[PDB]
Every structure is written in C-alpha cells, then in structure tokens.
C-alpha cells in the first residue's frame, strides 16, 4: 500500500512539473503580447 | 492514517485537474489575443 | 516512512498553492491585454 501511495505521489509530482513548465511558457508569450500592444499603440498613436 | 493520506492525495489530484483545465482556457484566450494583435497590425499597418 | 510521505505531500501542496497564485496573476494580465486590444481597435478603427 505504501508503494501505491508513493507511485501516485510520483505521478502528481511529474504532472506538477509539466504544469510549471507550461506556466513559464504562457508567461513568456503573455510578455510578447504586451510588447506587441505597446509597440502598436506607440508606433500608431 | 493511510486513509488520511489517501484523502489528501485525492484533494491534490482534484485541484491539479482544475488547474490543468484553467491552463487550457488561458492558452486558448492567449491564442485569441495573438490573433487580435496580428489582425490589428495587418489591417492597419 | 509515513512522515516522509507526509512531508512530500506538504511540499506538493505548497507548490500547488504557488501555482494557483501564479495562474490568478496570469489571468489578470491577460484581461488587461484584452482590454488594450479592445481599446486600440475601438479608438483607431
Ligand atoms: Cl500541480
Ligand atoms: Cl495576450
């Protein structure tokens, strides 16, 4: 039963790592969209 | 004590599923904002 | 061994809380970028 719990924890940890990786990618893209809106407003208006 | 650990794991798993769902929604909206910035720049500039 | 499992669960929970916090911040910034694209399109076009 302990091994079953340990395996489930490993699975949750692995997925948490994937989620953290996704979040960093989202943050980077979000920063690029901020840049684009800022560049648009400045270059046009 | 094992049941207490198993219940906590279930709670963490449930919340992880909610987080994954939120992340997909964020990604989709982020893709729409990219589209909007791209469409703006192309249609105007 | 139970304490080791309980400590790992605490670590995963702590990181899950940080992730939830990050997600809320991403959502708020994403809402601001939506506002900016909407304001741009309306003010210009
Ligand atoms: Cl997670
Ligand atoms: Cl965006």
Residue numbers in the entry:
A (entry chain A), B (entry chain A), C (entry chain A): 1 to 45
Give sentences copied directly from the paper behind this entry.
Eventually, HIV developed resistance to PIE12-trimer by mutating Q577 in the gp41 pocket. Expanding on our earlier work that selected for viral resistance to PIE12-trimer, here we describe the biochemical, structural, and functional properties of the primary PIE12-trimer resistance mutations (Q577R/N/K). As in all previous d-peptide/IQN17 structures, IQN17 forms a continuous trimeric coiled coil with the d-peptide binding to the gp41 hydrophobic pocket region. In the WT structure, Q577 hydrogen bonds with d-Glu9 and d-Trp12 in PIE12. Q577R disrupts these hydrogen bonds, likely accounting for the loss of affinity, and induces a repositioning of two adjacent residues (d-Glu9 in PIE12 and L581 in IQN17, although d-Glu9 position is variable in the WT structures). Q577R disrupts two hydrogen bonds between PIE12-trimer and the inhibitor-binding pocket and substantially decreases binding affinity. The Q577R mutation results in a dramatic (~ 65-fold) weakening of the interaction between PIE12-monomer and the hydrophobic pocket (Q577R KD = 2.0 µM vs. 0.031 µM for WT), corresponding to a 2.5 kcal/mol weakening of the PIE12 interaction. Because our inhibitor is trimeric, we expect the impact on PIE12-trimer’s binding energy to be three times as great, corresponding to a geometric drop of binding affinity of 653 (or > 250,000). This large decrease in binding affinity is consistent with the prediction that an extremely disruptive mutation is required to overcome PIE12-trimer’s highly charged resistance capacitor. In an HXB2 pseudovirion, Q577R confers > 4000-fold resistance to PIE12-trimer. Q577 mutation confers a significant fitness defect as seen by delayed viral replication.
